């Protein structure tokens, strides 16, 4: 049980593969850091957890509430995941073996587009994460 390579949430990251997204195979007990990088120019993001249907349709339902809201460019904002049952998260955010979790953002990257529900960098720049837990290739 170890620390996976950190994932910076931004267009610059190579690990998002066009049409696919970032795909990971963490095992229960592992850590992963998702980071909203601080700063001449800045991207504004609201990062969410969704199921497959919504990840494919690149849409967020109104009830959802984000893991990360990065509206603050002057500071680094970090979300540390350990894959296990219990997290301080309000929804319960549980990680069980042999289950899949999707992380997307529908946002333009512009401050005016931070609250955008549909499309966004999920749809265009392919910012999506698929975490297959307790599984491998």
């Amino acid at each position: 049980s170890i620390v996976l390579e950190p994932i910076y949430w931004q267009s610059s990251n190579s690990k998002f593969l066009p049409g696919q997204g970032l795909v990971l195979y963490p095992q229960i007990g592992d850590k992963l850091d998702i980071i909203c990088p601080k700063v001449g120019q800045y991207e504004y993001y609201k990062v969410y957890m969704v199921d497959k249907d919504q990840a494919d349709r690149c849409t967020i339902k109104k009830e959802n509430t984000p893991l990360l809201n990065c509206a603050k460019p002057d500071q680094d904002i970090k979300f540390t995941i350990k894959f296990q049952e219990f997290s301080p998260n309000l929804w319960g955010l549980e990680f069980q073996k042999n289950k899949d979790y999707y992380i997307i953002s529908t946002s333009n990257g512009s401050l005016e587009g931070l609250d955008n529900q549909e499309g966004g960098v999920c749809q265009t720049r392919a910012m999506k994460i698929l975490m297959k837990v307790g599984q491998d290739a």
């Binding site: 509430t65 809201n69 997290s87 301080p88 073996k97």
Partner: protein, 430 residues
């Protein structure tokens, strides 16, 4: 007569006993796990979660939730209610004696429960609904609220609370019973509730006094206001409060629903009321932008007004925008309920089992502290132990301070999830 014994339990109170009131590098808590009280499950897929424990007058009430492949309280098929006694086994330490266990009649419909032990009997206050989303899209007239009560000898009687006859101090569409426990003072029960309201009726002076980085394009006032909104339905606000219930032999109820003081409001989260040191303590979990311990003794009932500790050391983990030690106003949700028990007034001392981590839920450490500094601490396990909730109660057993804590633990990865109970002693010497 050889059948008689003096009671080994007393409420921790009165002239301070002698124990370690200052810093200590390696304290001896005499920490022992109590594994015989809480049931064990044959099906490893059953998850026992969300433990609740109230100790009063030598007797205790335990509650937990059972659900399949789900540790969420909402997915629970069965909710377990336990009554018991605190006893001297000659162990040189307090013991839990389990008298009764029953499952809630309405378990499939249970939204939330809070225990209180009163007059040596267990009472449980429950919010029941045919609608799992009832706090988001519904109102309290559509739901039911019950008091289940029992003891060692008697079989459980569960009676319905005439909510129709209640009087509220504000206009609330909904409320739930939420927290680690309530109290009884005279003929009155007082139970922690989280209330729902449709209009922003609230002032945030405290929140507005902060100066630090906020989300661009948004005013501080906007943030402080919007931070009390249910993240599920932005048209609703969640405000903590209490329900006061008067009764005569479980008949002739008089019920009042009051909201908490508007001084330093925090987003509605599970709270607790407990009797200690001759006072009454209110605790509130920190589920929003202010991540430091939120607690205080109750200086006024109407409005319900705890005098908030100003505590610069104790905090809680959460992931993302408001991790541990984050004091800047934001719209963010999360955290862990880890309540506290007072040790000594004069020295302003408290125990709590707290999670030592910035983000992850793990590493419970028994911590003894004042507002300013941590006096002493010990990890509960030498191995990484995934734990979410924690509760702690304290009392005098044989004229010394003793504590019992329940931890909501996942020890074996993802399977046979069961909470752990612990008893431990406050060090006499540093």
């Amino acid at each position: 007569s050889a059948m008689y014994s003096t009671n080994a339990y007393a409420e921790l109170a009165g002239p301070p006993k002698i124990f370690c009131k200052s810093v200590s590098k390696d304290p001896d808590f005499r920490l022992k796990q109590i594994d015989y009280v809480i049931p064990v499950q044959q099906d490893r897929s059953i998850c026992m979660n969300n433990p609740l424990l109230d100790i009063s007058d030598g007797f205790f009430t335990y509650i937990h939730y059972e659900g399949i492949n789900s540790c969420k309280k909402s997915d629970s098929f069965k909710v377990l209610l336990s009554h018991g006694e605190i006893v001297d086994r000659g162990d040189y330490r307090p013991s839990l004696y389990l008298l009764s266990s029953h499952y809630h009649p309405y378990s499939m419909q249970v939204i939330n429960c809070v225990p209180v032990t009163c007059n040596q009997s267990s009472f449980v206050f429950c919010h029941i609904s045919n609608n799992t989303k009832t706090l988001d899209n519904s109102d309290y007239s559509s739901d039911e609220y019950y008091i289940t009560y029992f003891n060692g000898i008697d079989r459980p009687k569960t009676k319905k609370i005439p909510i129709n006859n209640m009087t509220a101090d504000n206009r609330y569409i909904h409320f739930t019973f939420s927290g680690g426990g309530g109290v009884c003072l005279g003929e009155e029960f007082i139970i922690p509730v989280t209330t729902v309201i449709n209009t922003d009726v609230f002032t945030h002076d405290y929140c507005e006094s902060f100066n630090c980085s906020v989300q661009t394009g948004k005013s501080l006032k906007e943030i402080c206001s919007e931070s009390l909104r249910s993240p599920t339905n932005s048209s609703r606000y969640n405000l903590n409060g209490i329900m006061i219930i008067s009764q005569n032999n479980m008949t002739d109820f008089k019920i009042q629903l009051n909201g908490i003081t508007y001084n330093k409001l925090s987003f509605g989260s599970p709270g607790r009321l407990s009797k200690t040191l001759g006072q009454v303590l209110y605790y509130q979990s920190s589920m929003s932008w202010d991540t430091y311990l939120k607690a205080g003794f109750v200086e006024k009932w109407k409005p319900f007004t705890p005098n908030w500790m100003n505590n610069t050391v104790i905090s809680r983990p959460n992931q993302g925008n408001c991790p541990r030690y984050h004091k800047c106003p934001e719209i963010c949700y999360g955290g862990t309920y880890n309540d506290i028990a007072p040790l000594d007034l004069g020295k302003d001392m408290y125990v709590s089992v707290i999670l030592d981590s910035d983000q992850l839920a793990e590493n419970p450490e028994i911590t003894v502290f004042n507002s300013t500094t941590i006096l002493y601490k010990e990890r509960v396990s030498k191995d990484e132990l995934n734990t979410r909730s924690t509760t702690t109660s304290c009392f005098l057993f044989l004229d010394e301070p003793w504590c019992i804590s329940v931890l909501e633990t996942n020890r074996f990865n993802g399977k046979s999830i069961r909470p752990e109970i612990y008893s431990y002693k406050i060090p006499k010497y540093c």
